[PDB]
Design a protein around this ligand. Structure first.
Ligand SMILES: *[C@@H]1O[C@H](CO)[C@@H](O)[C@H](O)[C@H]1NC(C)=O
Ligand SMILES: *[C@@H]1O[C@H](CO)[C@@H](O)[C@H](O)[C@H]1NC(C)=O
Ligand SMILES: *[C@@H]1O[C@H](CO)[C@@H](O)[C@H](O)[C@H]1NC(C)=O
Ligand SMILES: *[C@@H]1O[C@H](CO)[C@@H](O)[C@H](O)[C@H]1NC(C)=O
Ligand SMILES: *[C@@H]1O[C@H](CO)[C@@H](O)[C@H](O)[C@H]1NC(C)=O
Ligand SMILES: *[C@@H]1O[C@H](CO)[C@@H](O)[C@H](O)[C@H]1NC(C)=O
Ligand SMILES: *[C@@H]1O[C@H](CO)[C@@H](O)[C@H](O)[C@H]1NC(C)=O
Ligand SMILES: *[C@@H]1O[C@H](CO)[C@@H](O)[C@H](O)[C@H]1NC(C)=O
Lengths: 337, 27
């Protein structure tokens, strides 16, 4: 049997040498060119156990994106463990690109192709690939942006649904576009627009899938975050090099029993880091129109639990490993033996 | 995550604190 194994996965991408955009620059020295001739081989009569919650691929990706950010996005000031560091904080061009992960000789990547795959247990339609599909390393909270959609229907995944402390990862089957803009010419005020009916229909379908999981006699409710750091209370993400903090109360105040949803956003200089515990300060926002149009392809939720009859779900996230998990869930690395 | 500044913060909100990665989260 080819047992699961840890190896030196290398990265591949379509990064250009003439792009000063930071993902391109990093990939230029860290990655090889995208596989010109990919080969997926189906393994017949093979069943294989996967575990998306215990996957070294996620750990390796996490380290790479950390290195990417730590070389690319330099804050003017950084506070960690009581130690203060200051440096030149030049603004950069910032737009994530797809990164493929590939297995070196002696190893192979197995891929689960089952449509309703929950993340753990046996897979009956397994194939081997030389590289994963292209994954944009988007760092965000609450909403998963520019990821891959579920093929058939919405899928919800958790390491343990009955444990309310475990994050629930939602994978949509239809994207919901969200446009966030800091208009040209209050330099920190911004806003995010999305279709009201599309979001309401999305929450409606997520609730159905949650009822399947927790009980048909349950009343599903969405409420905003209970509190914490700004990065998790709001939908937070980097756009064009600027850190956005978007109030998502309207998105997550819903129960079963306008045209656009407009969320108020703020651009912040002082942020809590995701790479490590500490704070960082960047220079004020750039002038001109700052704008990103993204596909919402997933959500990160937490359940209140405790005591009864009703189940309240709130936007979650925080550990960026779950972001990487939302794309790497169908992969595992094995050694050829 | 700093769980203690966190719990010390969340308890002032009527809630318990816990780590969400490198961030503070209230429950
Ligand atoms: C297995 O999955 C692959 C990829 O989705 C598909 O091409 C193939 O038809 C599937 N086979 C069966 C028997 O489901
Ligand atoms: C995932 O599905 C398998 C069956 O294929 C089941 O044994 C396991 O308990 C499930 N785990 C979840 C839903 O977390
Ligand atoms: C967004 O989703 C649409 C379809 O839902 C797809 O055509 C498009 O390529 C996606 N964009 C990105 C950047 O993934
Ligand atoms: C998306 O999934 C939902 C169930 O979660 C289903 O009702 C709907 O038809 C699906 N739409 C597409 C385009 O796959
Ligand atoms: C899931 O979580 C519950 C609550 O913590 C626990 O009782 C149960 O044993 C867990 N399931 C496992 C470990 O398979
Ligand atoms: C998002 O922006 C696109 C153009 O980039 C526009 O066509 C679309 O209507 C916008 N959607 C919303 C909900 O504002
Ligand atoms: C979120 O926005 C709502 C209105 O949209 C506002 O009442 C609330 O105070 C805001 N809270 C945070 C934490 O942004
Ligand atoms: C999503 O992809 C689009 C298209 O490349 C890009 O403009 C946008 O900035 C991306 N969103 C995030 C949050 O990176």
């Amino acid at each position: 049997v080819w047992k699961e194994a840890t190896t030196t996965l290398f990265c591949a991408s379509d990064a250009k040498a003439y792009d000063t955009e930071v993902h391109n620059v990093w990939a230029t020295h860290a990655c090889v060119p995208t596989d010109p001739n990919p080969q997926e081989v189906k393994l017949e009569n093979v069943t294989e156990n996967f575990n998306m919650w215990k996957n070294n691929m996620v750990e390796q990706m996490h380290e790479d994106i950390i290195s990417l950010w730590d070389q690319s996005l330099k804050p003017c000031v950084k506070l960690t463990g009581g130690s203060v560091i200051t440096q030149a904080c030049p603004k950069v061009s910032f737009e994530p690109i797809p990164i493929h992960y590939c297995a070196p000789a002696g190893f192979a990547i197995l891929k689960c192709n089952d449509k309703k795959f929950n993340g753990t247990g046996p897979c009956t339609n397994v194939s081997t690939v030389q590289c994963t599909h292209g994954i944009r390393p988007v760092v965000s909270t609450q909403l998963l942006l520019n990821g891959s959609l579920a093929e058939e229907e919405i899928v919800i995944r958790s390491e343990n649904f009955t444990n309310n402390a475990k994050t629930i990862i939602v994978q949509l089957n239809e994207s919901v576009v969200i446009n966030c803009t800091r208009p040209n010419n209050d330099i920190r005020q911004a806003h995010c627009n999305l279709s009201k009916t599309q979001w309401e229909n999305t929450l409606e379908q997520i609730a159905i899938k949650l009822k399947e999981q927790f009980g048909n006699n349950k009343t599903i409710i969405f409420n905003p975050s209970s509190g914490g750091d700004p990065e998790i209370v709001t939908h937070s993400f980097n756009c064009g090099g600027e850190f956005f903090y978007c109030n998502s109360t309207q998105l997550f105040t819903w129960n079963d029993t306008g045209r656009n949803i407009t969320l108020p956003c703020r651009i912040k200089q002082i942020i809590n880091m995701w790479q490590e515990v500490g704070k960082a300060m960047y220079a004020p926002p750039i002038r001109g129109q700052i704008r990103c149009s993204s596909n919402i392809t997933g959500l990160l939720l937490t359940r209140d639990g405790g005591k009864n009859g009703t189940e309240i779900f709130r936007p979650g996230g925080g550990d960026m490993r779950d972001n990487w998990r939302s794309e790497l869930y169908k992969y595992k690395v094995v050694k050829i033996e | 995550x700093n769980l203690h500044f966190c719990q010390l913060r969340c308890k002032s909100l009527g809630l318990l604190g816990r780590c969400a990665x490198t961030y503070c989260a209230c429950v």
